[PDB]
Design a protein around this ligand. Structure first.
Ligand SMILES: N=C(N)N1CCCCC1
Lengths: 247, 10
C-alpha cells in the first residue's frame, strides 16, 4: 500500500495473511485474502497459480504484523485451494482472478471469531456503488514501488471507484478492463495497492454494511498517473462463490 | 519495453 496509514487487524478483522512454505522450511508471504465465513477465505488465483499445491500454504487470521506474531492470532492449513477454471493472464491483466481457500487448523477447526477475527459480508449481486465512492484497501504490500522489502505493519488507504468508461479509455487501460473488473485510484494518484497487496480486500460501505466489493488483482506499477488499481468485481462472481462454498 | 503488473512503468 503506497501512502495511506498504518493500521492494525482490529480495523480489518477479516484480513487474511497468506504464506508459502519452502523445501528448506522457510516461509514467505504470498498474498492477502478475506475471511468470508469461518472456513473460507477469498483471494486471487494469480497468487497461487505457479505453486498450486494446497499443502504449500499457511493462512493467518488475527494478524497485524508480517513476520512476528500478534497476540490472539490463529494459524491454518489449507484444506482446499479452489482456483477459478476461467483464469487467464494476458500481456497486462489477469482475468477471473479469484480463489477460495478452505482453511482448517491442526486441530481440525475453522476460525473462531474474536475482537481480532471477524467475517466480511459479500455484496448483493451485480450491486456496486457509484463511481467516485470512496473505498478502503488493506495489505502488507510494498510502501513504494522501488522498495525491496514489505512493511512489517499492516496498512490501509482509501481510493475512489472509477467508472468503466473512464478506466477503458486508451489513456488508462483501454480494452484490458472488462465488466468483471473494478477500477479505483486516488485523484492525485498518490495512494494505491502495490506488489504484495494482491488478493486483499477492497471494502466499500454500501447501504450501512461493510461489504467486500473487490479483490486486489492488477495494475501497471503502483500509484502511477492514468494507471488505476484493478480489482476483481466480487458482485459478478457470487454464483461461483456460493457454488464452491455450499460444500 | 515490457509491462508486468505491479512493479513499474516498463
Ligand atoms: N494498485 C495496482 N497499482 N497494483 C495492485 C496489484 C499489484 C501491483 C499493482
Amino acid at each position: 500500500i503506497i501512502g495511506g496509514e498504518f493500521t492494525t487487524i482490529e480495523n480489518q478483522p477479516w484480513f487474511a495473511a497468506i504464506y508459502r512454505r519452502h523445501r528448506g522450511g522457510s516461509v514467505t508471504y504470498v498474498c492477502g485474502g478475506s475471511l468470508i465465513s469461518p472456513c473460507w477465505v477469498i483471494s486471487a488465483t494469480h497468487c497461487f497459480i505457479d505453486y498450486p499445491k494446497k499443502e504449500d500454504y499457511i493462512v493467518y487470521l488475527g494478524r497485524s504484523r508480517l513476520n512476528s506474531n500478534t497476540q490472539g492470532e490463529m494459524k491454518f492449513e489449507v484444506e482446499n485451494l479452489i482456483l477459478h477454471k476461467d483464469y487467464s493472464a494476458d500481456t497486462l491483466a489477469y482475468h477471473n482472478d479469484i480463489a477460495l481457500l478452505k482453511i482448517r487448523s491442526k486441530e481440525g477447526r475453522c476460525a473462531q471469531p474474536s475482537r481480532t477475527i471477524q467475517t466480511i459480508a459479500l455484496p448483493s449481486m451485480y450491486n456496486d456503488p457509484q463511481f467516485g465512492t470512496s473505498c478502503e484497501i488493506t495489505g502488507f504490500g510494498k510502501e513504494q514501488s522501488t522498495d525491496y522489502l514489505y512493511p512489517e505493519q499492516l496498512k490501509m488507504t482509501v481510493v475512489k471507484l472509477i467508472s468503466h468508461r473512464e478506466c477503458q479509455q486508451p489513456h488508462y487501460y483501454g480494452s484490458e478492463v472488462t465488466t468483471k473488473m473494478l477500477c479505483a485510484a486516488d485523484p492525485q494518484w498518490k495512494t494505491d495497492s502495490c506488489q504484495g497487496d494482491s488478493g486483499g480486500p477492497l471494502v466499500c460501505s454500501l447501504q450501512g454494511r461493510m461489504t467486500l466489493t473487490g479483490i486486489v488483482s492488477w495494475g501497471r506499477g503502483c500509484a502511477l498517473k492514468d494507471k488505476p488499481g484493478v480489482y476483481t468485481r466480487v458482485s459478478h462472481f457470487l454464483p461461483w462463490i456460493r457454488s464452491h462454498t455450499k460444500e | 519495453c515490457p509491462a508486468y503488473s505491479x512493479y513499474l512503468d516498463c
